[PDB]
Amino acid sequence: MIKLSQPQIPEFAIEKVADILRGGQLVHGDECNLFEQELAEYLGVKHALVVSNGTAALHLALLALNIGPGDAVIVPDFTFTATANIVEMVGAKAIIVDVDKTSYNLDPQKLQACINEWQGPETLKAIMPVLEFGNPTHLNAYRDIAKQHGLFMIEDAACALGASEQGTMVGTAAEFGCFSFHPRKTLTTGEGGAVVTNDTELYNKVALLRSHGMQGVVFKCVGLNYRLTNFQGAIGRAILPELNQWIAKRRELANQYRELLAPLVEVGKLTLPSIVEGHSVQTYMTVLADNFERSDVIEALRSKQVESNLGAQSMSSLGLFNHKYNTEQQYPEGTRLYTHGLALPLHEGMNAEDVATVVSALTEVLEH
Amino acid sequence: MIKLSQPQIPEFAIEKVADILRGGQLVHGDECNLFEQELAEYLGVKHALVVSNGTAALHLALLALNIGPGDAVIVPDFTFTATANIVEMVGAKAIIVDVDKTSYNLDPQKLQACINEWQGPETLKAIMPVLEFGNPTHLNAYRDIAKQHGLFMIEDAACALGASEQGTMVGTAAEFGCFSFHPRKTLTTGEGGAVVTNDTELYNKVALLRSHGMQRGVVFKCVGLNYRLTNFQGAIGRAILPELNQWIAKRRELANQYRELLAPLVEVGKLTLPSIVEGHSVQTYMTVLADNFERSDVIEALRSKQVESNLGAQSMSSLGLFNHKYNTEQQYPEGTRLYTHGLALPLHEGMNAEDVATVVSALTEVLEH
Ligand SMILES: [Cl-]
Ligand SMILES: [Cl-]
């Protein structure tokens, strides 16, 4: 099976994990602390904190900004459901805005309109743009719009470690950046994530919330347990020095897809993602024409040893985010991407031959 | 250093972890699913779900029972701060009740008084007793009290996997049992925990909440979190579980050695001992020093003599975090005494009787000077 992802954890990392299990510290220790330093340097950001997963990162960012009951956060329609769920979990309302059909990211003009029209009843406090599939497109615009309207910005950069727009590393534009180390997301720790910020007060607050309010040890506030193990930290920091080369490889494979898929684009059978400068290419998602039954395409591809899937969900389609605004607005772009999107294998373990294999299979399936 | 704990992960488990990292599934997989089955069978409970840590287990239990803003949960004064924090984090108010001096667990008579006097304004929905340090004492009383008053019961069994009272395995008495696999807590996965229940509806709800509301196409049934445990952490846990009864048995032998060796210090009035009842899993062995000793100086002196020692747990009422009216109107002299004067001594399955003797020798010397 040509799989969507297959992260290869360096052998030296596996040996370090074994050493830690045998005779080392299991809870967050030197490996996590070094990983945080190294992430901060990689991103050019003042502070990083590693946490249990990327959902935990978003959760902590919301809590640290005192976003909760009575409040609202704008989210894109097209994303993994965690983005909207976590807003609701803190007691805030997820306010959905449609995405761009090209970038698959929150549409800046529709974002502006939403903010312009907002008059409650909840207090609108933040935007949570998603840099979907590693696409940094609109990062700087989101920052500008947030500043223009007095909003916080939490980047849901789950899929975007190593992406960048116009000199800005994704995750670093505003109050918080949130990353995932899930196995589909290029750098993995099995489960893991990170919160980054340039604001030391926000850093200190997340560090308290991550571990029971602990600062001898004093308990300064109520908190949670979102600590990452020391051995998970060891895995992550072993992979980080490889990430740029993995992204470069992914960009080369994306160009191969672009070249080889052109015949299908020309006859209107699918559209391609736009793998802009700075895209980290965590996912390569095409969009099938409406006349294809996507579930049947996925099944046929599986039978030809190609793993494929939808790329993400449409929040407005799920029936979970029922703020009035979301009932009033329409989300054709996110709905199209949710219904017709098709992610194809793209990861650093593949070569050009593997890309051609995938395109051959997809061409065959769409012919029949 | 004779340390408070030092869990030995079996080499075969380390090899299995390496195999998973090299060529296996990293996210919750066959190892977690088998661990859940094996935990359920160990406890004699219908359902188990492994989660990121023991705090996550409590969190999911609260959420599954729809405990939140406008609600109240009773917690013991003496516990790790997570017990009370997690109540507050869901928007409920932690209502503190004192522990008893013998067991260090929530005092049933004071619990009854609190419930009887409760008249709001919040809706009192649950008790969250702690089976502190592996002590099952009062488990069945808590069950009976919750049933008498129409309350849910969430056992904070962080430190009590394998403990039992009068035939009831800790974690299995009522709606939910919550366990921690932190490295201090005998069975470890580095970080980890579990939620158990006999109620299939509660199981199904926690499973949704653990993973984004996902139900297997995947459907999103409700808003949720990510509290999944990795498959490799699950592999560690299920490798250790078959050893846990042997480890507890060894810990109860070591406790009996402490009991014998510390009798002179008890008889002369310098400390009091824990009561290691039938069914105690002996996760922690906490003594209480006489008031004339400065406990922080005792810890520092023991450190200089290669003995790790610490306070056992916190007093919630001391922390200034749980400010419901009720908590201001009560004193908590028992939890205060345990917080201020309690001293945990090394007790884990890697020690032998000679090591216990070493610890007692050191403590005797420190308390003489
Ligand atoms: Cl540890
Ligand atoms: Cl995986």
XYZ file of C-alpha atoms and ligand atoms in Angstrom:
739
model
C 0.000 0.000 0.000
C 1.255 3.484 -0.896
C 0.193 5.147 2.318
C -0.714 8.739 3.076
C 2.090 8.962 5.648
C 4.678 6.606 7.098
C 6.966 8.557 9.476
C 10.412 7.027 9.942
C 11.720 7.638 13.416
C 15.559 7.619 13.365
C 17.110 4.510 14.859
C 19.246 6.642 17.220
C 15.952 8.032 18.589
C 14.536 4.547 19.113
C 17.723 3.666 21.035
C 17.361 6.841 23.128
C 13.750 5.959 23.922
C 14.880 2.481 24.995
C 17.593 4.020 27.193
C 15.025 6.338 28.785
C 12.608 3.495 29.493
C 15.404 1.370 30.948
C 17.163 3.865 33.188
C 15.999 7.444 32.558
C 13.328 9.971 33.507
C 9.948 9.154 32.011
C 8.048 12.378 32.724
C 8.839 15.610 30.879
C 12.559 16.099 31.367
C 15.724 17.192 29.611
C 14.554 15.880 26.237
C 11.342 17.915 26.369
C 13.157 21.032 27.594
C 15.759 20.737 24.806
C 12.998 20.037 22.259
C 11.256 23.285 23.330
C 14.496 25.275 22.966
C 15.139 23.723 19.560
C 11.548 24.326 18.341
C 11.763 27.945 19.436
C 15.038 28.409 17.530
C 13.665 26.607 14.469
C 10.657 28.932 14.367
C 12.447 32.102 15.421
C 9.976 32.528 18.284
C 10.766 33.369 21.910
C 8.991 30.459 23.615
C 7.751 26.928 22.989
C 5.992 24.400 25.225
C 5.449 20.788 24.240
C 2.131 19.203 25.176
C 0.125 15.957 24.865
C -1.294 16.650 21.375
C -2.246 19.461 18.987
C -5.778 19.655 20.413
C -4.247 20.243 23.847
C -2.167 23.045 22.349
C -5.290 24.820 21.044
C -7.053 24.188 24.348
C -4.272 25.761 26.369
C -4.089 28.775 24.039
C -7.827 29.385 24.525
C -7.596 29.016 28.301
C -4.550 31.275 28.555
C -6.455 33.998 26.681
C -9.481 33.592 29.041
C -11.740 32.558 26.187
C -14.732 30.673 27.548
C -18.465 31.008 28.331
C -19.989 34.079 26.811
C -17.273 34.351 24.121
C -16.951 33.555 20.405
C -14.077 32.505 18.154
C -14.076 32.504 14.345
C -12.994 29.214 12.718
C -12.793 28.142 9.046
C -15.456 25.852 7.639
C -12.881 23.416 6.224
C -10.630 21.869 8.888
C -10.292 18.873 11.143
C -13.192 18.950 13.620
C -10.869 19.564 16.621
C -10.543 23.249 15.608
C -14.237 23.995 16.203
C -14.727 21.374 18.908
C -12.093 22.852 21.189
C -13.673 26.303 21.035
C -16.981 24.767 22.108
C -15.275 22.701 24.823
C -14.087 25.833 26.655
C -17.673 27.171 26.529
C -17.131 29.587 23.625
C -19.105 29.539 20.352
C -17.411 28.579 17.089
C -18.375 31.080 14.423
C -17.786 29.545 11.008
C -16.437 31.455 8.015
C -15.946 29.883 4.586
C -12.563 29.072 3.020
C -10.931 30.013 -0.271
C -11.451 27.436 -3.002
C -7.770 27.821 -4.091
C -5.855 27.739 -0.774
C -8.439 25.854 1.291
C -7.747 28.417 4.039
C -10.086 30.870 5.773
C -11.189 33.483 3.235
C -9.921 36.930 4.379
C -12.732 38.898 2.743
C -15.429 36.659 4.258
C -13.570 36.918 7.574
C -13.687 40.714 7.397
C -17.415 40.610 6.626
C -18.104 38.314 9.598
C -16.235 40.571 12.014
C -17.923 43.674 10.519
C -21.380 42.205 11.047
C -20.677 40.868 14.563
C -22.828 42.466 17.264
C -23.101 39.598 19.737
C -24.625 38.389 21.891
C -21.316 36.693 22.724
C -18.075 38.649 22.964
C -16.035 37.983 19.798
C -12.481 37.555 21.097
C -10.320 35.678 18.561
C -9.732 34.240 15.172
C -8.418 30.696 14.848
C -7.240 30.430 11.236
C -6.045 27.018 10.086
C -2.948 26.762 7.923
C -4.580 23.787 6.319
C -2.400 20.939 4.980
C 0.688 23.075 5.576
C -0.506 25.985 3.455
C 0.676 29.367 4.889
C -1.491 31.357 2.479
C -3.079 34.439 4.124
C -1.042 34.132 7.362
C -0.010 37.822 7.303
C -3.496 38.976 6.288
C -4.973 37.092 9.280
C -2.515 38.875 11.575
C -3.421 42.259 10.047
C -7.168 41.624 10.289
C -6.860 40.494 13.908
C -4.880 43.636 14.770
C -7.356 45.897 12.894
C -10.255 44.549 14.962
C -8.599 44.072 18.361
C -8.821 40.255 18.225
C -6.433 37.632 19.441
C -5.121 35.209 16.847
C -4.451 31.552 17.584
C -2.909 29.790 14.612
C -4.128 26.240 14.220
C -0.844 25.199 12.665
C -1.482 21.502 13.419
C -0.419 20.565 9.880
C 2.037 23.421 9.256
C 5.292 23.130 11.269
C 7.975 24.441 8.933
C 5.602 26.388 6.657
C 6.099 30.126 6.132
C 4.628 33.150 4.351
C 6.573 36.236 3.211
C 9.319 35.756 5.832
C 6.940 34.827 8.707
C 7.211 31.228 10.070
C 3.753 29.771 10.570
C 2.902 29.736 14.251
C 4.710 32.997 15.014
C 2.505 35.773 13.624
C 0.495 36.738 16.717
C -0.406 35.546 20.232
C -0.142 31.797 19.773
C 0.862 29.085 17.363
C -0.337 25.503 17.879
C 1.269 22.438 16.260
C 0.457 18.724 16.165
C 2.926 15.827 16.165
C 0.274 13.260 15.203
C 1.693 10.573 12.853
C 0.021 12.056 9.754
C 1.701 15.448 10.436
C 5.324 14.896 9.188
C 7.115 15.333 12.500
C 5.598 12.837 14.951
C 5.896 11.885 18.607
C 3.053 9.370 18.311
C 0.798 11.902 19.933
C 2.184 15.323 20.756
C 1.971 19.021 20.063
C 3.396 22.415 20.903
C 2.270 25.876 21.893
C 4.533 28.761 20.835
C 4.392 32.472 21.600
C 6.558 35.578 21.732
C 4.703 36.749 24.862
C 6.380 35.669 28.095
C 3.242 36.235 30.190
C 1.283 33.891 27.880
C 4.169 31.365 27.998
C 4.174 31.405 31.791
C 0.383 30.934 31.941
C 0.385 27.978 29.533
C 3.238 26.368 31.514
C 1.064 26.573 34.650
C -2.050 25.256 32.914
C -0.123 22.355 31.390
C 0.764 20.957 34.843
C -1.859 21.527 37.517
C -0.936 25.180 38.149
C 2.477 24.111 39.475
C 5.238 26.694 39.802
C 9.285 24.406 46.602
C 6.293 23.765 44.315
C 3.406 26.219 44.659
C -0.041 25.817 43.084
C -0.783 29.196 41.499
C -4.034 28.399 39.652
C -6.295 25.547 38.640
C -4.958 23.642 35.642
C -4.800 20.369 33.678
C -2.288 17.687 32.793
C -1.142 18.097 29.210
C 2.475 17.078 29.711
C 4.413 15.166 27.044
C 6.622 12.285 28.181
C 10.404 12.636 28.094
C 10.661 9.760 25.621
C 8.082 11.319 23.285
C 10.147 14.541 23.516
C 13.239 12.539 22.525
C 11.526 11.306 19.356
C 10.415 14.763 18.332
C 13.748 16.439 18.783
C 15.471 13.645 16.812
C 13.206 14.369 13.832
C 13.234 18.188 13.874
C 16.723 18.465 12.204
C 15.352 16.376 9.295
C 12.160 18.402 8.810
C 13.379 20.944 6.265
C 14.803 18.222 4.066
C 11.583 16.241 4.357
C 9.577 19.312 3.354
C 11.930 19.938 0.401
C 11.394 16.334 -0.728
C 7.617 16.720 -0.338
C 7.706 19.847 -2.478
C 9.531 17.915 -5.231
C 6.879 15.138 -5.130
C 4.116 17.796 -5.279
C 5.624 19.180 -8.459
C 5.626 15.660 -9.916
C 1.914 15.359 -9.127
C 1.295 18.746 -10.712
C 3.010 17.697 -13.936
C 1.448 14.236 -14.145
C -2.112 15.226 -13.152
C -2.374 17.932 -15.830
C -4.284 15.691 -18.326
C -7.004 15.078 -15.731
C -7.203 18.789 -14.906
C -7.495 19.640 -18.604
C -10.619 17.493 -19.092
C -12.226 18.836 -15.882
C -12.013 15.636 -13.843
C -10.260 17.282 -10.898
C -8.606 20.441 -9.576
C -5.201 20.623 -7.887
C -4.048 22.219 -4.633
C -1.839 25.273 -5.037
C 1.489 24.373 -3.429
C 2.721 27.914 -2.939
C 6.096 29.016 -1.701
C 6.363 28.169 2.000
C 3.799 25.316 1.854
C 5.027 22.429 4.003
C 2.949 19.918 2.001
C 1.597 17.966 4.948
C -1.311 16.879 2.699
C -1.738 16.964 -1.084
C -5.493 17.320 -1.640
C -7.142 17.385 -5.058
C -10.829 18.027 -5.665
C -12.792 15.554 -7.793
C -15.461 16.677 -10.231
C -19.049 16.343 -8.952
C -19.889 13.413 -11.234
C -17.569 11.071 -9.340
C -18.708 9.199 -6.244
C -15.721 9.895 -4.046
C -16.327 6.924 -1.725
C -16.193 4.634 -4.798
C -12.947 6.274 -5.974
C -11.375 5.710 -2.549
C -12.441 2.035 -2.540
C -11.144 1.462 -6.068
C -7.808 3.125 -5.229
C -7.447 0.909 -2.150
C -7.874 -2.177 -4.353
C -4.950 -0.794 -6.410
C -2.726 -0.296 -3.330
C -3.280 3.462 -3.028
C -4.469 4.942 0.254
C -6.616 8.028 -0.221
C -9.176 9.842 1.856
C -11.094 13.028 2.338
C -8.744 15.823 3.408
C -10.820 17.454 6.146
C -14.367 18.133 7.325
C -16.894 20.900 6.746
C -17.815 22.263 10.184
C -21.174 23.592 8.917
C -22.104 20.097 7.663
C -21.614 18.378 11.040
C -24.591 19.829 12.985
C -22.442 20.549 16.065
C -21.776 24.295 15.776
C -25.219 25.795 15.879
C -24.608 29.464 16.582
C -27.160 31.610 14.732
C -24.486 33.036 12.413
C -23.690 29.559 11.117
C -27.366 28.937 10.344
C -27.615 32.275 8.454
C -24.445 31.953 6.380
C -23.778 29.481 3.547
C -20.487 27.575 3.081
C -20.255 26.361 -0.511
C -16.467 26.257 -0.657
C -15.867 24.253 2.503
C -18.768 21.995 1.563
C -17.246 21.309 -1.854
C -13.821 20.507 -0.320
C -15.428 18.226 2.286
C -17.619 16.399 -0.236
C -15.243 16.114 -3.217
C -11.725 16.512 -1.798
C -9.295 13.605 -2.332
C -5.930 13.452 -0.542
C -3.260 11.466 -2.396
C -0.133 9.910 -0.810
C 2.626 12.414 -0.368
C 5.395 11.818 2.136
C 9.178 11.859 2.228
C 9.418 8.010 2.014
C 8.071 8.122 -1.567
C 9.990 8.706 -4.797
C 8.999 9.940 -8.255
C 8.177 6.375 -9.307
C 5.615 6.173 -6.457
C 3.993 9.438 -7.567
C 3.649 8.079 -11.108
C 2.129 4.871 -9.651
C -0.512 6.888 -7.816
C -1.360 9.040 -10.837
C -1.655 5.925 -13.041
C -4.086 4.351 -10.577
C -6.161 7.519 -10.247
C -6.280 7.984 -14.038
C -7.476 4.387 -14.396
C -10.162 4.740 -11.728
C -11.539 7.995 -13.158
C -11.585 6.449 -16.678
C -13.797 3.603 -15.391
C 19.547 7.398 46.655
C 16.840 5.079 47.992
C 14.050 6.582 45.940
C 10.282 6.776 46.482
C 9.677 4.815 43.257
C 11.708 3.414 40.374
C 9.470 1.394 38.032
C 11.186 -1.323 36.007
C 9.702 -1.650 32.560
C 10.299 -5.252 31.369
C 12.897 -5.563 28.614
C 10.383 -7.340 26.360
C 8.148 -4.264 26.620
C 11.051 -2.004 25.671
C 11.668 -4.223 22.628
C 7.976 -4.060 21.743
C 8.088 -0.259 21.979
C 11.122 -0.234 19.657
C 9.288 -2.514 17.208
C 6.250 -0.204 17.232
C 8.354 2.908 16.634
C 10.281 1.191 13.827
C 7.424 -0.383 11.920
C 4.155 -0.342 13.895
C 1.083 1.816 14.534
C 1.910 4.762 16.822
C -1.615 5.982 17.639
C -3.936 3.996 19.898
C -4.026 0.517 18.395
C -4.016 -3.187 19.188
C -1.874 -2.674 22.291
C -4.257 -0.115 23.774
C -7.313 -2.206 22.912
C -5.793 -5.325 24.494
C -4.667 -3.289 27.520
C -8.282 -2.085 27.962
C -9.599 -5.647 27.793
C -6.937 -6.846 30.223
C -7.561 -3.973 32.692
C -11.290 -4.679 32.622
C -10.701 -8.370 33.348
C -8.195 -7.539 36.112
C -10.727 -5.289 37.843
C -13.805 -7.404 37.118
C -15.443 -4.360 35.481
C -17.341 -4.341 32.172
C -15.414 -1.547 30.429
C -12.061 0.250 30.459
C -10.658 3.098 28.333
C -7.039 4.163 28.419
C -6.303 7.901 28.273
C -3.442 10.405 28.306
C -3.122 10.608 32.116
C -5.115 10.227 35.345
C -6.238 13.877 35.301
C -7.701 13.262 31.833
C -9.565 10.240 33.261
C -11.223 12.394 35.942
C -11.929 15.091 33.356
C -13.711 12.675 31.032
C -15.707 11.199 33.907
C -16.960 14.665 34.866
C -17.821 15.565 31.269
C -19.593 12.230 30.624
C -21.833 12.913 33.668
C -22.642 16.458 32.440
C -21.039 18.050 35.483
C -20.154 21.627 34.766
C -21.200 25.256 35.372
C -23.812 25.535 38.080
C -22.781 22.215 39.694
C -20.790 21.090 42.718
C -18.648 18.074 43.517
C -17.358 17.031 46.947
C -13.603 16.311 47.194
C -11.355 15.409 50.150
C -9.137 18.031 51.711
C -6.049 15.788 51.507
C -5.154 14.770 47.954
C -3.097 15.776 44.956
C -4.320 19.118 43.627
C -5.622 17.604 40.352
C -8.666 16.183 42.166
C -10.042 19.623 43.048
C -8.566 21.448 40.027
C -10.365 19.246 37.500
C -13.727 19.906 39.110
C -13.096 23.639 38.787
C -11.832 23.248 35.223
C -15.197 21.918 34.001
C -16.872 24.905 35.690
C -18.154 23.050 38.774
C -17.260 24.064 42.357
C -15.024 21.832 44.495
C -16.621 21.399 47.914
C -13.998 20.331 50.387
C -14.640 17.823 53.162
C -11.997 16.728 55.682
C -10.306 13.311 55.745
C -9.926 11.066 58.728
C -6.631 10.861 60.524
C -6.319 7.049 60.359
C -7.008 6.345 56.684
C -6.139 9.745 55.189
C -9.321 9.300 53.094
C -12.526 11.399 52.956
C -14.247 11.127 56.331
C -17.675 9.434 55.849
C -19.314 11.205 58.816
C -18.131 14.642 57.638
C -19.223 13.691 54.119
C -22.717 12.897 55.360
C -22.845 16.207 57.249
C -21.856 18.171 54.157
C -24.468 16.482 51.974
C -27.154 16.859 54.635
C -26.496 20.612 54.992
C -26.242 21.294 51.260
C -28.928 23.661 49.972
C -27.149 25.265 47.003
C -26.878 27.523 45.226
C -25.098 25.049 42.949
C -26.559 21.614 42.171
C -24.622 19.023 44.166
C -24.126 16.192 41.677
C -21.243 13.935 42.741
C -18.661 12.816 45.209
C -15.059 12.314 44.127
C -13.469 10.325 46.943
C -9.739 9.642 46.713
C -8.390 6.212 47.587
C -5.294 7.934 48.786
C -1.904 6.169 48.517
C -3.708 2.941 47.542
C -5.904 2.829 50.650
C -9.353 1.373 49.797
C -10.752 2.265 53.239
C -14.321 3.617 53.046
C -14.849 2.599 49.374
C -18.113 0.800 50.102
C -19.282 3.530 52.519
C -18.783 6.125 49.752
C -20.840 3.979 47.387
C -23.620 3.642 49.942
C -23.615 7.374 50.753
C -23.753 8.343 47.082
C -26.671 5.937 46.530
C -28.510 7.179 49.633
C -28.357 10.761 48.357
C -28.810 10.251 44.599
C -25.215 11.335 43.829
C -22.832 10.117 41.198
C -19.508 8.743 42.477
C -16.257 9.173 40.580
C -13.425 7.331 42.295
C -10.145 9.153 42.095
C -8.204 5.915 42.155
C -5.067 7.547 40.727
C -2.931 5.761 43.312
C -5.054 2.658 43.838
C -5.045 0.256 40.873
C -5.165 -3.206 42.433
C -6.520 -2.045 45.813
C -9.820 -3.475 47.106
C -12.216 -3.307 50.059
C -14.474 -6.178 51.199
C -14.503 -7.757 47.696
C -14.963 -4.509 45.774
C -11.987 -3.675 43.512
C -11.170 0.007 43.741
C -12.475 1.808 40.671
C -15.549 -0.439 40.291
C -17.964 0.624 43.044
C -20.169 3.083 41.144
C -20.321 5.154 37.938
C -16.626 5.651 37.239
C -13.154 4.664 38.395
C -10.134 6.729 37.357
C -6.538 5.507 37.488
C -3.122 7.111 36.826
C -0.069 5.467 35.247
C 2.289 8.273 36.274
C 5.768 6.903 37.253
C 5.154 7.260 41.000
C 1.952 5.090 40.738
C 3.327 1.486 40.520
C 2.070 0.640 37.028
C 3.453 3.305 34.666
C 3.237 4.225 31.012
C 5.295 7.396 31.572
C 2.074 9.359 31.441
C -1.208 7.508 31.210
C -4.471 6.669 32.860
C -7.724 4.806 32.553
C -11.466 5.338 32.982
C -13.505 2.265 33.933
C -17.233 1.749 34.318
C -19.918 -0.942 34.325
C -22.280 1.345 32.409
C -22.145 0.883 28.618
C -23.726 4.287 27.971
C -21.036 6.036 30.034
C -18.337 3.972 28.293
C -19.630 4.979 24.877
C -19.736 8.647 25.878
C -16.190 8.666 27.244
C -14.956 6.944 24.090
C -16.507 9.755 22.032
C -15.084 12.494 24.274
C -11.591 10.927 24.202
C -11.283 11.356 20.421
C -13.073 14.385 19.008
C -16.578 12.855 19.170
C -15.563 10.291 16.535
C -17.737 7.189 16.094
C -16.792 4.429 13.648
C -17.217 6.129 7.689
C -16.258 8.159 10.762
C -19.097 10.342 12.101
C -18.650 13.250 14.555
C -21.391 12.722 17.145
C -20.513 15.452 19.647
C -17.809 17.928 20.555
C -14.854 16.308 22.318
C -11.144 16.380 23.162
C -7.995 14.408 22.402
C -7.027 12.288 25.400
C -5.787 9.273 23.485
C -2.844 7.165 24.713
C -0.222 6.076 22.175
C -0.044 2.441 21.140
C 3.525 2.216 22.484
C 2.497 3.594 25.881
C -0.288 1.036 25.885
C 2.295 -1.691 25.178
C 4.238 -0.664 28.272
C 1.176 -0.707 30.508
C -0.067 -4.105 29.444
C 3.434 -5.583 29.909
C 3.415 -4.428 33.538
C -0.151 -5.334 34.503
C 0.606 -9.115 34.893
C 3.287 -8.191 37.465
C 1.147 -5.760 39.483
C -0.252 -8.235 42.041
C 3.302 -9.528 42.756
C 4.531 -5.935 43.125
C 1.686 -5.104 45.519
C 2.400 -8.263 47.537
C 6.058 -7.221 47.813
C 5.026 -3.696 48.841
C 2.797 -5.118 51.606
C 5.754 -7.173 52.889
C 7.916 -4.050 52.939
C 5.129 -2.176 54.737
C 5.056 -4.896 57.410
C 8.802 -4.452 57.839
C 8.326 -0.709 58.360
C 5.549 -1.439 60.853
C 7.871 -3.602 62.943
C 10.944 -1.393 62.627
C 9.152 1.916 63.279
C 7.410 0.665 66.459
C 10.070 2.204 68.791
C 9.621 5.633 67.167
C 5.829 5.274 67.495
C 6.025 4.127 71.121
C 8.147 7.184 72.117
C 5.693 9.493 70.288
C 7.861 10.794 67.419
C 5.530 9.730 64.585
C 2.388 7.833 63.632
C 2.085 5.158 60.978
C -0.306 4.619 58.058
C -2.852 1.891 58.555
C -2.063 -0.626 55.838
C -5.390 -2.446 55.854
C -6.388 -5.524 53.937
C -6.616 -4.548 50.282
C -4.229 -1.558 50.536
C -2.034 -1.403 47.401
C 0.700 0.571 49.222
C 1.388 3.076 46.470
C 2.737 5.426 49.155
C 3.803 4.761 52.766
C 3.162 8.013 54.601
C 3.969 8.547 58.260
C 3.071 11.649 60.236
C 5.869 13.386 62.208
C 5.303 14.858 65.651
C 4.678 18.604 65.681
C 8.103 19.410 67.195
C 9.935 18.465 63.966
C 10.354 20.817 61.014
C 9.338 18.467 58.202
C 11.253 20.403 55.506
C 14.469 20.039 57.546
C 13.793 16.302 58.031
C 13.441 15.904 54.246
C 16.715 17.777 53.634
C 18.577 15.757 56.245
C 17.278 12.451 54.824
C 18.382 13.602 51.339
C 21.931 14.098 52.680
C 21.706 10.455 53.904
C 20.544 9.142 50.499
C 16.860 8.766 51.411
C 14.247 10.431 49.204
C 11.244 11.545 51.229
C 8.522 14.081 50.664
C 5.145 15.311 51.715
C 2.456 12.816 50.729
C -0.233 15.150 49.367
C -1.645 18.680 49.575
C -4.400 20.281 51.634
C -6.914 21.757 49.196
C -8.241 24.251 51.747
C -4.724 25.709 52.236
C -4.171 26.525 48.582
C -6.557 29.482 48.195
C -7.924 28.090 44.894
C -11.239 26.502 45.921
C -13.145 29.426 47.342
C -16.727 28.192 47.484
C -18.465 29.599 50.578
C -18.637 26.153 52.190
C -14.860 25.842 52.186
C -14.479 29.121 54.121
C -16.979 28.057 56.835
C -15.180 24.819 57.705
C -11.811 24.057 59.269
C -9.922 21.023 57.979
C -7.612 20.081 60.878
C -6.967 16.523 59.668
C -6.017 17.342 56.096
C -3.972 20.262 57.451
C -2.055 17.977 59.816
C -1.314 15.482 57.024
C -0.202 18.206 54.609
C 2.015 19.930 57.203
C 3.484 16.919 59.017
C 3.148 13.933 56.679
C 6.334 12.214 55.529
C 6.385 9.603 52.779
C 9.197 7.056 53.004
C 10.555 4.944 50.141
C 8.448 1.910 49.472
C 8.530 0.165 46.146
C 8.934 -3.330 44.767
C 12.635 -2.842 43.874
C 13.556 -2.494 47.578
C 14.324 -5.302 50.000
C 14.099 -5.627 53.791
C 17.653 -4.342 54.165
C 16.652 -1.144 52.331
C 13.738 -0.600 54.731
C 16.173 -1.002 57.613
C 18.453 1.582 55.990
C 15.567 4.057 55.771
C 14.485 3.518 59.351
C 18.102 3.905 60.555
C 18.389 7.233 58.726
C 15.039 8.523 60.000
C 15.897 7.455 63.565
C 19.177 9.351 63.350
C 17.550 12.465 61.934
C 14.793 12.539 64.518
C 17.304 11.997 67.350
C 19.284 15.075 66.283
Cl 10.046 9.735 35.868
Cl 0.109 5.560 13.374
